Design a protein around this ligand. Structure first.
Ligand SMILES: [Zn+2]
Ligand SMILES: [Zn+2]
Ligand SMILES: [Zn+2]
Ligand SMILES: [Zn+2]
Lengths: 7, 571, 90, 83, 107, 97, 572, 7
């Protein structure tokens, strides 16, 4: 987990 | 305790058991009795004996006057739609055919049928059948156009405020603007002739139409204009309708101090009147959870969609778009809440449910089907990473690739190239290309994502910063362009604490990325410079984590009407 | 060029011949022995008037560029008109 | 004795829509429209099938990566006429 | 409203290009290229596809003329002619071709 | 375009006419089949005589209310316009019985 | 360009909109109008208003006589049965109640109730509702047999030839033989009174009864009596029924040349008379693909099941037993076709559909579910071995373990332990054990089927050679007994060229079964011998394989029915 | 594969 929450 | 049944509940079960012989005479019973006979048929499960009577418009006019037992009608109506028979499309067509025949009548018969249309079209729109409610209103609208006096102009604007609402749940936005322009034609004609109409409900719809098309700059302009016309004489249903849409435009405006007072007043105003079971109360919770998810209050946002879904799962039956919309947002909220944990099995069930419902009741090329399709794809790509099976990793990640592109096409067809929703799919597709090992392709998607959002939203905004962090992780973790990523991480850091402070729980993927940023370019002194801030983020997050649930945060009577409006308007 | 369309109750509904050729039965009634009157002892006058109203509705609205409005068939007349539509094959 | 004329050429399909991406058949597929509309444009071929359902080549390749049947008619997919 | 400008420009670029009326081939390219970076990348797609069709028309007519010269049997067209190929989905010249035609034996 | 029916006693004239046309030319249409002099024939819409000078649009026979499906009516006299018939009165069902 | 709606089709919308005030007056409308009013209730989606007006026999029988639009009626009727309403059962009970109420009446009046039974029974059997068309015919045979005269015996055999069809199609084979015994009584009464009826429909239907029970030898010998009874006066409906069932018996007894001329004439006869989308023409194509599946033309057979599923999916809706058997035949044909390619995604969907339908309209303990449960497991076994996951490999075959177990138990209940259909379940189950790590009992399942199939057919039949090649492949790869495996490939190879020729598609699975059997046995010169003939097998397959649409191969047969039936009897 | 077509 590296891209934060998906928009 | 074994209490005997009332004679009413016994005579009900004795005329329902003799329904075939007494079907002719039941239709002559009073409205309170007649609905209780028909609801007993639903209780006995004899839907065929029931849908044979709801398909007639005159009976569905009688069982629509039982306002106390409307919550039972929605569950009885939704059961018919899933049972087979298209009782919504038959009623809408049977009304339009009957409405088209009284065009050459007086203003007494016409007003009788227009009021039938406003409670029928007000029911299909309430149950989610927007494509079938519009056909009722479009017939009610052409009754008001026949007579061109001051009396009927107030109903033509009463249809156009509702037509503007059934054309947004149906995602027919390009007809919505023409509806609003036609409303002003019937508004200026009425307003000029010595009778000013309340332009408050109508501007509230534009606060959701222009919000839907990502015109947040235009949404807030009509957000202010909607609440300037709020008057204590307005119905509570209208007033709570303006507040929830006003909150959604204010939250996306990234100003949260004025947003909370609008929606927390809306939840209270939709709980003291409508109660904790009316669908309008759950409708307000759905928009209330929109506020919670954008203010990083994700912990209790799931608990407010689950409350919103559970109300709709009880009033609106099994396969309904309103149930599906709640399934969509709950799946997204569970996606965001459990992103760190990585376990998506309840979230996948909700996202799969929202597609199993919408694909059944909507065409394959519907905009609302696209937004519910991206949520499953976001969940699938995370399962396609967490799972250790390479065969499962490739195929599930490919399935999420077809969903974004299908979702992007539907958004790109109606919202155009330059919109936030179109760019939101670029960022999601950019994150997917990162997981698909297509780092070259993942570069150009985020660049197109940020450039569209930066051009529309502005140089500094929360949506832009969250998209940059997607690109920052690309340049840092798997493309090794640390110099390019150095400015991107810092760009999101300033915006992230601009509206949330250092305790923003999304900064965990921003601070940790900075640690890996400096791990491969030397300068280990700054590694510890960001290492304590991560502990500072840990301290500033868990301490404020302990907070009461948002359901009791509104409490009982927190504020008063015509006070939140004045407080918001002056600011 | 005009067709004498009498009714069961001796009510005449004359109309242009090209309008009366929409129904295949009237076209067959004109053919053979006897642009003159035709016996209509079964169909009543109140429903044959709507048939004649449909005749000018069908011919005028052929290949129309605009959307054709629904032909009004009143509920009290619908069942009797339907048999007239089948008998006339209109 | 001298002439000059235009030619509005189009693919032989009359369905007019790529059933996987819903874009117009003559326009670029949704995959080409996503990243670059000119660099990948020249290879946006259409592929026919034994069922005679012409689709975008990139779209039908994406479809064949996951599933193994024609989208419209659920028969098996065998290319015949790459355009 | 830039969308109605694109339709109005396409309905006029198409009439300008096919008639041979142009200041230079690069000048129309420069105008098309400027809109690509100014308004949007996908904004100038049908407009850009309106170009690069006459650009390959000269290339294609060379191949077309070479095709008949390399024919096995001797086939003479007689009336010399060249063709511009146009995409159906790009040019606005489709209109409503509901009228048929039967060209005589001269071509 | 204006569609009308012309009823004297029971004859009915389903003949179209332009909205700008006058009553005079429509009277010539009636004599085409009724083979009667046009001066004797007079028309009475809602029991009111129509002047030959005024056009069809000035008598209220607007093309927007003279559709082919429901053409407007106009009387005729050389009034005894008898009704066609009484359609069977269908029950209202919801009425008590 | 926006044609005005017809006055009739506009009055239909007006009458339907006033359904409440005219539902008792629509039944007084003409027969052709009544169906078109009740059709608009289905088109508008008013299934619930329609379901209460097709559950009534007094008004459904008026709809049934509108035989111009019967293709629309099958769609409405099927759209009700999966809607929830039991139109088939209620129409069965309503007619049986009428028969008991009218049995005591005059026989002349009883004849009219017989005719409705033939129309209603002939419809419910055409829609694949034999379990509810049985009670219509049972109440029709019982009604007609009360008075025994020369007029009733004509209808009594007709009530029994249809009862044979609706009992054979429902896998009531045990009751079918008893039903034919009742037929033997009434023909004798008709014959002994100086009257003769055509028994081609009855004898041909009995052939399907024996064919289902795997009595191929008894079925084929019954074709000859069926075929010789064909005359010029028989309806095309009967002639197609005789030819279609005679083809299935001919192709199972390895008489492909005689089977070809029959089914290729049956398809033409159905297409020439019964339109091109009639359910009967779909029935002929579903058994024309059966012929082409058994003569090594698999690449063309699946293109005909798709031309027989797409007919049964446009006349009947979903959740029908006719579209279920059309799914189960294509799910197997595509399974054979994509055996080498490993593209069973289509063949799995067409097998889940057949499973998901029969489990919904038929009870669990029904033989028709057995023939669809075996196929789904056949696709399910090659999906596992294609996958590279241990967890999926175990559970998929375990599901295929239960499906064969369910199919074997369901088939043994009605057929018995000594029938080919139950024998074929062992052979498929044995091949499953070849990948289930159950090799010790894997050979036992094969050899149990081997000695059953040889017992019933012989040593020179194609059915046993399929498991013989499978049994010897078990030895080559798992049992490691190369001595008794090479003796079985030669038996399979010799019969392959004897029956089909050198282009048999199964010749790859034992030629390559010999390139490794001889690889590890020591012989190396003969390895090059079978390596050469495999290339020879490839080199003749290139010219032999001609993909021609068999639908257009049968376009116009220059022979009529008289020539084909005489040519079949001349050969036999 | 190893086995022939199922039956
Ligand atoms: Zn495409
Ligand atoms: Zn492409
Ligand atoms: Zn296809
Ligand atoms: Zn029902």
């Amino acid at each position: 987990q590296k891209r934060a929450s998906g928009q | 305790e074994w209490i005997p049944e009332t004679l009413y509940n016994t005579a009900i079960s004795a005329v329902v058991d003799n329904y075939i012989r007494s079907r002719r005479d039941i239709r002559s019973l009073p409205e309170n009795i007649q609905f209780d006979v028909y609801y007993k048929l639903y209780q006995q499960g004899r839907l065929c004996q029931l849908g044979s009577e709801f398909c007639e418009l005159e009976v569905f006019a009688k069982v629509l006057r039982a306002l106390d037992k409307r919550h039972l009608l929605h569950h009885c109506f939704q059961a018919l739609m899933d049972h087979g028979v298209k009782v919504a499309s038959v009623l809408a067509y049977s009304f339009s055919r009957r409405c088209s025949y009284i065009a050459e009548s007086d203003a007494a018969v016409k007003e009788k049928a227009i009021q039938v249309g406003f409670v029928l079209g007000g029911f299909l729109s309430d149950a989610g059948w927007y494509s079938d409610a519009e056909k009722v209103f479009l017939s009610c609208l052409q009754l008001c156009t026949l007579h061109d006096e001051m009396l009927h102009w107030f109903r033509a604007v009463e249809c156009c405020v509702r037509l503007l609402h059934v054309r947004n749940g149906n995602c027919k936005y390009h007809l919505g603007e023409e509806t609003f322009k036609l409303a002003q034609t019937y508004m200026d004609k009425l307003s000029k002739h010595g009778q000013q109409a309340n332009k408050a409900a109508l501007y509230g719809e534009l606060c959701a139409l222009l919000f839907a098309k990502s015109h947040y700059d235009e949404a807030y302009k009509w957000c202010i204009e909607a609440m300037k016309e709020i008057t204590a004489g307005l119905p509570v249903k209208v007033v709570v309708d303006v507040l929830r849409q006003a909150s959604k435009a204010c939250v996306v405006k990234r100003e949260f101090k004025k947003a909370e007072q609008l929606i927390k007043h809306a939840v209270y105003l939709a709980r003291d009147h409508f109660g904790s079971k009316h669908p309008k109360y759950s409708d307000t919770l759905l928009d209330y959870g929109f506020y919670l998810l954008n203010v990083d209050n994700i912990c209790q946002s799931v608990a407010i969609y689950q409350a919103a879904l559970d109300i709709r799962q009880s009033v609106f039956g099994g396969k309904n778009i309103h149930v599906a919309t709640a399934h969509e947002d709950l799946a997204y909220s569970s996606y965001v809440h459990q992103y760190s944990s990585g376990k998506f099995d309840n979230a996948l069930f909700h996202a799969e449910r929202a597609i199993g419902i919408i694909t059944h009741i909507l065409p394959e090329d519907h905009l609302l089907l696209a937004s519910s399709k991206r949520v499953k794809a976001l969940i699938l790509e995370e399962i396609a990473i967490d799972c250790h099976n390479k065969e499962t990793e490739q195929r599930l990640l490919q399935e999420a690739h077809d969903l974004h592109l299908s979702s992007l096409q539907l958004a790109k067809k109606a919202f155009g190239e330059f919109n936030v929703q179109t760019a939101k799919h670029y960022g999601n597709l950019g994150r997917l290309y990162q997981s698909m090992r297509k780092f070259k392709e993942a570069e150009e998607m985020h660049i197109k994502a940020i450039q569209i959002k930066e051009q529309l939203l502005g140089q500094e905004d929360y949506e832009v910063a969250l998209s940059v962090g997607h690109l920052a992780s690309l340049y840092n973790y798997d493309m090794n362009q640390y110099e390019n990523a150095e400015k991107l991480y810092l760009r999101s850091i300033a915006i992230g604490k601009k509206l949330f402070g250092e305790g923003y729980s999304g900064l965990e993927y921003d601070y940790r990325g900075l640690i890996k940023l400096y791990n491969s370019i030397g300068n280990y002194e700054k590694v510890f410079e960001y290492h304590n801030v991560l502990s500072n983020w840990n301290r500033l997050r868990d301490r404020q984590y302990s907070v009461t649930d948002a359901l009791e945060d509104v409490s009982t009577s927190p504020q008063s009407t015509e006070e939140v409006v004045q407080s918001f308007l002056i600011s | 060029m005009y067709v004498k369309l009498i009714s069961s109750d001796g009510h005449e509904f004359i109309v242009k011949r090209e309008h009366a050729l929409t129904s295949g039965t009237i076209k067959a009634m004109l053919s053979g022995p006897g642009t003159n009157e035709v016996n209509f002892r079964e169909i009543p006058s109140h429903v044959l008037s709507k048939v004649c109203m449909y005749f000018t509705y069908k011919v005028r609205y052929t290949n129309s560029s605009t959307e054709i409005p629904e032909f009004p068939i009143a509920p009290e007349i619908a069942l009797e008109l339907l048999m007239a539509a089948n008998f006339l094959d209109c | 004795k001298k002439w000059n004329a235009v030619a509005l050429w189009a693919w032989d399909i009359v369905v007019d829509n790529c059933a996987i991406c819903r874009n117009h058949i003559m326009d670029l597929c949704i995959e080409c429209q996503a990243n670059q509309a000119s660099a990948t444009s020249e290879e946006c071929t259409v592929a026919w099938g034994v069922c005679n359902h012409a689709f975008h080549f990139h779209c039908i390749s994406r479809w064949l990566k996951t599933r193994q049947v024609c989208p419209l008619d659920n028969r098996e997919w065998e290319f015949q006429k790459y355009g | 409203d830039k969308d109605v400008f694109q339709k109005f420009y396409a309905r006029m670029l198409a009439k300008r290009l096919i008639h041979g009326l142009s200041m230079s081939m690069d000048s129309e390219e420069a105008m098309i290229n400027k809109l690509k970076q100014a308004c949007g990348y996908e904004f100038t797609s049908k407009l850009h596809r309106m170009y690069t069709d006459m650009s390959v028309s000269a290339d294609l007519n060379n191949k077309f003329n070479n095709f008949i010269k390399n024919q096995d049997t001797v086939i003479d067209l007689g009336i010399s002619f060249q063709i511009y190929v146009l995409q159906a989905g790009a040019w606005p010249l489709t209109q409503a071709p509901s009228s048929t035609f039967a060209i005589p034996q001269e071509l | 375009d204006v569609f009308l029916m012309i009823r004297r006693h029971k004859t009915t004239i389903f003949t179209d006419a332009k909205e700008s046309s006058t009553v005079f030319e429509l009277k010539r249409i009636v004599e085409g089949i009724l083979k009667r002099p046009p001066d004797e024939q007079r028309l009475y819409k809602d029991d009111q005589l129509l002047d030959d000078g005024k056009t069809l649009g000035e008598c209220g026979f607007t093309s927007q209310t003279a559709r082919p499906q429901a053409p407007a009516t106009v009387g005729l006299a050389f009034l005894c316009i008898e009704p066609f018939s009484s359609p069977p009165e269908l029950p209202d069902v919801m009425k008590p019985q």
